[PDB]
Amino acid sequence: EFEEPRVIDLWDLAQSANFTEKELESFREELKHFEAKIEKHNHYQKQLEISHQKLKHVESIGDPEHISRNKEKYVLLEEKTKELGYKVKKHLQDLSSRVSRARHN
Amino acid sequence: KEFECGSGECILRAYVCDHDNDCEDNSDERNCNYDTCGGHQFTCSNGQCINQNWVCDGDDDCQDSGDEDGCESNQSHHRCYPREWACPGSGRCISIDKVCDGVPDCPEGDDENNVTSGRTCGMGVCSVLNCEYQCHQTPFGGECFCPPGHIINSNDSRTCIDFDDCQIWGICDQKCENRQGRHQCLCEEGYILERGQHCKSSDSFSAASVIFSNGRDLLVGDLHGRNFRILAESKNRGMVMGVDFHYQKHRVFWTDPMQEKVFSTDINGLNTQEILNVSVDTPENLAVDWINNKLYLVETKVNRIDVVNLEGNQRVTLITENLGHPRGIALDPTVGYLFFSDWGSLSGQPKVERAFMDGSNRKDLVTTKVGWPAGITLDLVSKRVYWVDSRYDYIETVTYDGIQRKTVARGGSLVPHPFGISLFEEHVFFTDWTKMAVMKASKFTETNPQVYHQSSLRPHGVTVYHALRQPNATNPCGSNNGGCAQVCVLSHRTDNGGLGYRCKCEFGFELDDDEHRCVAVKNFLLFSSKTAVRGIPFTLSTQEDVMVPVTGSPSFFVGIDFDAQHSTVFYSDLSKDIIYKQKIDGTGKEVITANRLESVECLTFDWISRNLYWTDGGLKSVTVLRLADKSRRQIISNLNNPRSIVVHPTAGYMFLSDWFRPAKIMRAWSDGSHLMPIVNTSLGWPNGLAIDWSASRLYWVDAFFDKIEHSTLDGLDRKRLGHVDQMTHPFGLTVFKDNVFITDWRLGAIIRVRKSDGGDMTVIRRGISSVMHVKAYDADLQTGSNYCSQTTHANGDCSHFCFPVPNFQRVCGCPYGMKLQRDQMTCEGDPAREPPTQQCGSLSFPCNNGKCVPSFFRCDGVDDCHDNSDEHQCGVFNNTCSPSAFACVRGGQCIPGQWHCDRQNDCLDGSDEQNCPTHATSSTCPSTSFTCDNHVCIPKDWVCDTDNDCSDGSDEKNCQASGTCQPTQFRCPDHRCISPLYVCDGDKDCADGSDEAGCVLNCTSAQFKCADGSSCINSRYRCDGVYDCRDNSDEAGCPTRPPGMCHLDEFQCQGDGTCIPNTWECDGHPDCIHGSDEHTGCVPKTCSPTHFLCDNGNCIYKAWICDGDNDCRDMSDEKDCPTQPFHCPSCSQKCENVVGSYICKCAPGYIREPDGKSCRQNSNIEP
Amino acid sequence: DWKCDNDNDCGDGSDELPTVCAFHTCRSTAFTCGNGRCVPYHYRCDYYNDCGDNSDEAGCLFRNCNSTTEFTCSNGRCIPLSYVCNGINNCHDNDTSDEKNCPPHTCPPDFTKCQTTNICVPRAFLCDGDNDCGDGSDENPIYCASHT
Amino acid sequence: XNXXX
């Protein structure tokens, strides 16, 4: 019962790991939190795309004030989106490494 | 629908309560209070929870970088707080008052006059660049002072600007808090603030005292050390290793690895009792859990951390996995954390790590530059952990989460070899093996530790006895024993859903799904090795042992089996030549037999008839013994090298392996009669045997051909499992459920594969020394009956022995010297055919145990029977001590000669040390060496290496920080001098790493270089089937067998296509399935008339025929003349030229089909 | 194997005479009687006399069963109270204790009891070799052969 | 070889 391919893969691999049932339940909750994180990431990437569409329209228009406002919004939004992206990448690395370690031991 | 931010967006409700400001006005995170972070999670500055393993991993995770707030030590950066200045070129920082005091301060000496910079003590250009405050007289240039609460702003050089003094390391002892820029050193309850900076214990507590081991003895002294007193002397040549205390119990505990015991006493030293005395072979350290009245013990013979009640009851093991060399231990029951150090794990890394007090949620607290961490203590009020390093020679500190790493001492001139450590108020106390003293130092930073006590022996285990050292707190387990069935162990306060404790149960039991109740264990993996006999769960997740590890001091364990009705395990100590039995819980060790045992290689137990069988490699025989009456008999007498043995109580068979050159696996009735080979083709070294009880199939394993095979109990339906990746010398195996567990000698590991096919190799245990037999303990397996155990008539109506026989029958047997009378069920004594015998010959002394030892060993001072009888009541006028010993002259005690004049009084009368002469003379330490003050000689290069090689501290005496070494020596930066032999030797020795940095590992002779340049290995380890290089480059490119072929030195069997060594061809024994290796082309060997020709095809002297020795290795020279004296000495591919019907063989690379007329290609590849 | 086991396996008794059992030994897997006869070991304490002396069932311990549904006859056994006094010998004992517990009961003729034993059998199962009674008239010292 | 140490 998961919606993102990465969390499905991680759960599928962690099924065969040497996890205690307690650690398995805690890992399940952790994958739910990681799923929330990736949904936040893709939502804000799509928001970045829509802001890029507005920015493209503004730059085609060429208004300096519109360009400045859309820049203030867009560069900060891209910064935040990257902030979420690196966190998602790190969490994926942690979970995958832990599962792989728990498959061999 | 959704929450609306001030920006005007219906923001998803999931973005509220998530620590992230998801819209411009931050209203989504303005109100929502968040849940706390448990013990296994780290609190960020904003309250966010992250995994504990994310702290100090090298990545900023709290977006404040609070989880990476100074994980690296010695981060001076010339910054080092205001009022301080740094010597350029080193980064060392010195406060302002010391710079230009008239003497150099930093190791550079930049704080005084020098002509390189042209600097003199004086006020420079600061007279023009005045600040708002005092300028100063720094030689390099006038800098200016700052009042409290303010740094000098780097942009200004003139204005001091706010910061916090309350964060400076060492500003106040204990907690601090800042009042508008004024720091206040509040002290926790029970402490009185003094001098405005220091807090002292209130006189509501009975002063304080320091308890430490001076070496042999346990001493106690005041904080201002003047009144040392001996609290307990070590009896029987013991040594006090690690100490701890319980304040409210008035109790002090200590361990003793020379006597292999754990003791306890009161501070008056009167009431003394030994806590533990089984399976405590090397009790490295100790810790007291005062809240829950339990004792945490570190053991290093079998690396584990055990927790036990006071007075030594309710044993249970907490941590076993990857434990390597555990040395230090400490705990804080008020919070629920357990800290212990490790100077090298099974994975190699030395580390200091943290866990819950129940052993869960382990975490690498400190991992970089760790070295040899030897001791740990806790600052409970400040929530910091202190630990020492005996290899990089420092004392460092981190918080409970590992954030604020600070170093309090560094260098071989200060802390050459710390072992223990203890903390109290403003000071920290630590033993040192090189200074031979208990040291005293400031808890924050210090440059010259004062000697607190000086000892002539290596000291261990400092601790400070006080009430504030063990604060009061509530006990969750204090009510109803926590509700658990047997044992209640604390955990972190947030563990177990806020209950703060976890239920466990003693050895021989496991928890029910109710998780408070617990029931007996049903099955576990019993395995044996040289070090110990251990039992581990079959699941790989919960790795902790489930039985008390059996251990002996000179021991070497090989054989194992079990009796699940009594929950006991049988084992043979090949070093003692004794067979024991012992319960699961560790109690009840008893001797099964000790007579006529040369080398017992394997054990098996018939649980229905209660018979114990074992194979003797030295007697070349297998013996059966009944536990009910200790009677025994040899049932097979003239084997060559019997190794393994299994008995099938219901089927009534036994199976044993003989790996002498014509290797075979034999089957017999459980009586030992009807002996017959059942597997004698394609065998080399059949080390292990097993039975698949579900399918009734015999399993064996070869160490020559490295294959696992299984077959029916008749030897028919033989099958072979697939290749197992790295298996190259498998010794023992066992079958449980659908898996096969095998021990491998070359790997030194236990691997598990499927029993259906080759399986997926899973390494259960690794790096396990001289591993031996493995057996699956199983209470369910040992349920059954036969005509030997019917409830209505006992023992099958036999007198002494009853043996199951195939086809559901029984056969009676008799002990030695007794025969079955007419009845076939009752045994009558027959001394005529089997005369009664004595324990052993006239040349030796029979113990009171059944074992026999040489007469020279009697009264030599050391126990040789292991049931002390050769030293019992020696020294009487007529019973002399052996001339290798020394008699305590007033009579009644014979000590070994080695104990005479060894600076330790062993005799009851002290004669062993009385009248000892002086023996120095011209001790003549050669010119190539350094001479110690105790007249020992060591290599000159070992001087000033921060190691007490002289065993008196002389080679490290007067080892000031000189800045030079011996010319031959390599110098670690700011650490020590080291021998060049250790430079580029393979692993790290200096803290900065210079000794192993940048160098090239060009291999020696007979060594192979890995493809990645990781290391060099022996050429013997190349092309062996085991991966030795980390890149598997040692087994890459090795010669292989051509497809379907055999190597040029290997004859190919035409029946199956396997390969045998060429010397096995034309040897008289059919090694191939159909005997292709003994074709007519092989010429017979004719024996010179001076020799008899054996049935096995070998030559033996004419004189040795039926002489009473298995000279032909099959008794053919005996059985060819059992007439003995009755007196006293007083065409598909090839064609041949056979005489009759053709016997055409096929060419190599083909399989001769069962018709004997055609053959088929053997290669996988297609034509 | 059938030699010396109290069974006339050869018909003429040649395999059961004492003259051969004076030197014959039982098989190692066989139980030996006090007199010397040889018996398969599954006959040891199985509620049958096989050794002649009943020495194959001497010294045995048998489970005393519940008073709910057990009748314990002389050799020791456990059979239901309903099973006694009926047409089937459930306590196979020495002496017909399964149905001898009903001496004066009535089974009508042509469904006649075995003479002096209340096991009820038809008029002609006699002079035939089937163990149709453990007492009295199994082979009938007076009448046989359907007698018309 | 195959001997036990």
Ligand SMILES: *[C@@H]1O[C@H](CO)[C@@H](O[C@@H]2O[C@H](CO)[C@@H](O)[C@H](O[C@@H]3O[C@H](CO[C@H]4O[C@H](CO)[C@@H](O)[C@H](O)[C@@H]4O)[C@@H](O)[C@H](O[C@H]4O[C@H](CO)[C@@H](O)[C@H](O)[C@@H]4O)[C@@H]3O)[C@H]2NC(C)=O)[C@H](O)[C@H]1NC(C)=O
């Ligand atoms: C290696 O391991 C094998 C078993 O895998 C051993 O071979 C066996 O040796 C046993 C000797 O104890 C024998 O049981 C068996 O050999 C014979 O079995 C015969 C059964 O008769 C039928 O089968 C044979 C098969 O050859 C067939 O030819 C015959 O027509 C029947 O169909 C017995 O008749 C035979 O008796 C002969 O030998 C005995 C002495 O052993 C004499 O007393 C008899 O007069 C007669 O000559 C014999 O019992 C063997 N089975 C096989 C597979 O050959 C090897 O001994 C082992 N060798 C080593 C080096 O360890």
Ligand SMILES: *[C@@H]1O[C@H](CO)[C@@H](O[C@@H]2O[C@H](CO)[C@@H](O[C@@H]3O[C@H](CO[C@H]4O[C@H](CO)[C@@H](O)[C@H](O)[C@@H]4O)[C@@H](O)[C@H](O[C@H]4O[C@H](CO)[C@@H](O)[C@H](O)[C@@H]4O)[C@@H]3O)[C@H](O)[C@H]2NC(C)=O)[C@H](O)[C@H]1NC(C)=O
């Ligand atoms: C954790 O919590 C426990 C209580 O649960 C505290 O224990 C108390 O400790 C104090 C000392 O710090 C004790 O006070 C002293 O008691 C002495 C008599 O003790 C006897 O009787 C008690 C029962 O009442 C027994 O338990 C005990 O074993 C003894 O048999 C007094 O004689 C002392 O007074 C003397 O010294 C003081 C100065 O220290 C002088 O002012 C007096 O004039 C006199 O000379 C003193 O009063 C107290 O009794 C303990 N409580 C109990 C109930 O035993 C721990 O201190 C606490 N630990 C921490 C670190 O928090």
Ligand SMILES: *[C@@H]1O[C@H](CO)[C@@H](O[C@@H]2O[C@H](CO)[C@@H](O)[C@H](O)[C@H]2NC(C)=O)[C@H](O)[C@H]1NC(C)=O
């Ligand atoms: C380990 O400790 C116990 C004491 O706790 C010893 O037990 C005693 O054993 C002897 C036999 O050796 C008995 O006669 C005593 O009665 C036992 N005492 C108790 C209290 O049970 C045991 O011997 C010790 N073993 C070793 C190796 O020291």
Ligand SMILES: *[C@@H]1O[C@H](CO)[C@@H](O[C@@H]2O[C@H](CO)[C@@H](O)[C@H](O)[C@H]2NC(C)=O)[C@H](O)[C@H]1NC(C)=O
């Ligand atoms: C010679 O040495 C032995 C060993 O000490 C002594 O043997 C004693 O024998 C008696 C039985 O005869 C035992 O009860 C004692 O326990 C043994 N020991 C001692 C010291 O008495 C023997 O006594 C010694 N010779 C003499 C005459 O003392």
Ligand SMILES: *[C@@H]1O[C@H](CO)[C@@H](O)[C@H](O)[C@H]1NC(C)=O
């Ligand atoms: C020092 O200079 C930097 C760069 O101009 C500035 O950002 C910082 O705020 C200055 N420090 C203070 C305390 O003003």
Ligand SMILES: *[C@@H]1O[C@H](CO)[C@@H](O)[C@H](O)[C@H]1NC(C)=O
């Ligand atoms: C290894 O390398 C050094 C040069 O780097 C050389 O002088 C030395 O003789 C070599 N040693 C061996 C044992 O090959």
Ligand SMILES: *[C@@H]1O[C@H](CO)[C@@H](O)[C@H](O)[C@H]1NC(C)=O
């Ligand atoms: C029936 O047998 C059981 C043992 O299985 C015994 O406990 C019980 O007492 C018996 N019933 C009666 C009525 O005694």
Ligand SMILES: *[C@@H]1O[C@H](CO)[C@@H](O)[C@H](O)[C@H]1NC(C)=O
């Ligand atoms: C057992 O059997 C015989 C009849 O076959 C009988 O004569 C003997 O008395 C019996 N013993 C008892 C006590 O029933």
Ligand SMILES: *[C@H]1O[C@H](CO)[C@H](O)[C@H](O)[C@H]1NC(C)=O
């Ligand atoms: C004596 O030796 C014989 C073998 O020669 C048996 O092992 C016997 O059991 C021995 N008995 C004793 C008491 O040592």
Ligand SMILES: *[C@H]1O[C@H](CO)[C@H](O)[C@H](O)[C@H]1NC(C)=O
């Ligand atoms: C002790 O004295 C003896 C002579 O009595 C020898 O000289 C011996 O060398 C001395 N050793 C010491 C260390 O004084």
Ligand SMILES: *[C@H]1O[C@H](CO)[C@H](O)[C@H](O)[C@H]1NC(C)=O
């Ligand atoms: C020991 O060797 C040293 C170095 O050669 C001296 O020669 C010394 O005199 C020697 N002394 C003895 C007793 O051999």
Ligand SMILES: *[C@H]1O[C@H](CO)[C@H](O)[C@H](O)[C@H]1NC(C)=O
């Ligand atoms: C292994 O070596 C043989 C020669 O001994 C052949 O080269 C064979 O092709 C090799 N096998 C593989 C898989 O490389």
Ligand SMILES: [Ca+2]
């Ligand atoms: Ca938010």
Ligand SMILES: [Ca+2]
């Ligand atoms: Ca981090």
Ligand SMILES: [Ca+2]
């Ligand atoms: Ca100075």
Ligand SMILES: [Ca+2]
């Ligand atoms: Ca050191």
